[PDB]
């Protein structure tokens, strides 16, 4: 589709020129555009050319490509990757749920609760224990803890030479 | 260990063979490649101007394609969530 199609749709292939079916050679031209030849049987084709996604936002490109796959029953997979360094992930909050750890978070959580009801006197005066009780160990699922709440920001900033 | 596999130069060491053909073979894998806005527009109601200039350099712009000749997907419900941070 980066070729000047209106001038090259003739003069591409010779035997198509002989038979006179040059207007029906597969190509781009001539929100999304519905292709037609994807309705009849596809036996002598093996490759899908995908065009129109460069320059757009990531999530909309994913949504549009997946819906287009669903509408015509095509077979391929889709992933996305980034160019850069790791510490650029500062414009987003990171969280997650792993099944492998669920049975642990319960096991721990209730345990702490029990310990609360046996050292309550001294513990309800230590500020650190109250903050740790009301920030963690009081949430239903571990998925609600973001990645930034697990470490000290100042030491991490001290880890890069630029901060000095 | 999951977030570190979102980067091109580190994904490439576990799955070598990425090439650009402008599409995907039947049954293959289509890889999009994106970058932050800060790296494209290097140097081009004042408060609305400032917030627009800031948010339009945090966007993810799709820049390139590659293809792979295999699909890797098969019922676990573990996942990772990424939430855009407010300005």
């Amino acid at each position: 589709y980066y070729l000047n199609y209106p001038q090259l749709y003739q003069y591409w292939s010779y035997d198509t020129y002989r038979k006179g079916r040059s207007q029906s050679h597969p190509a781009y031209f001539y929100n999304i555009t519905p292709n037609s030849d994807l309705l009849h049987r596809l036996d002598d084709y093996s490759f899908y050319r995908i065009e129109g996604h460069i320059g757009e936002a990531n999530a909309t490109a994913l949504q549009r490509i997946l819906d287009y796959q669903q509408r015509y029953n095509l077979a391929f997979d889709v992933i996305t990757l980034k160019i850069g360094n790791l510490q650029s992930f500062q414009d987003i909050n990171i969280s997650g749920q792993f099944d492998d750890l669920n049975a642990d978070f319960g096991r721990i959580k209730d345990t702490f609760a029990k310990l609360w009801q046996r050292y309550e006197e001294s513990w309800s005066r230590n500020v650190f224990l109250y903050t740790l009780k009301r920030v963690f160990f009081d949430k239903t699922s571990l998925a609600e803890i973001k990645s930034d709440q697990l470490f000290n920001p100042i030491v991490a900033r001290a880890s890069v030479k630029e901060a000095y | 260990q999951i977030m570190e596999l979102q980067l091109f130069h580190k994904f490439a060491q576990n799955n070598p063979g990425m090439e650009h053909l402008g599409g995907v073979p039947k049954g293959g894998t289509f890889v999009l490649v994106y970058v932050d806005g800060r790296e494209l527009v290097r140097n081009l109601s004042p408060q609305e101007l400032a917030t627009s200039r800031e948010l339009l350099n945090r966007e993810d712009i799709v820049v390139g394609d590659f293809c792979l000749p295999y699909r890797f997907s098969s019922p676990t419900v573990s996942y990772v969530l990424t939430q855009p941070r407010p300005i």
């Binding site: 099944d99 049975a103 096991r107 | -």
Partner: peptide, 22 residues
């Protein structure tokens, strides 16, 4: 109330098992 550790553990485990089976 002595079974509450088992309560939370089994709630989480049975939820995960239920989702996979569903």
């Amino acid at each position: 109330a002595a079974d509450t550790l088992n309560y939370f553990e089994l709630k989480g485990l049975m939820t995960a098992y239920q989702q996979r089976l569903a």
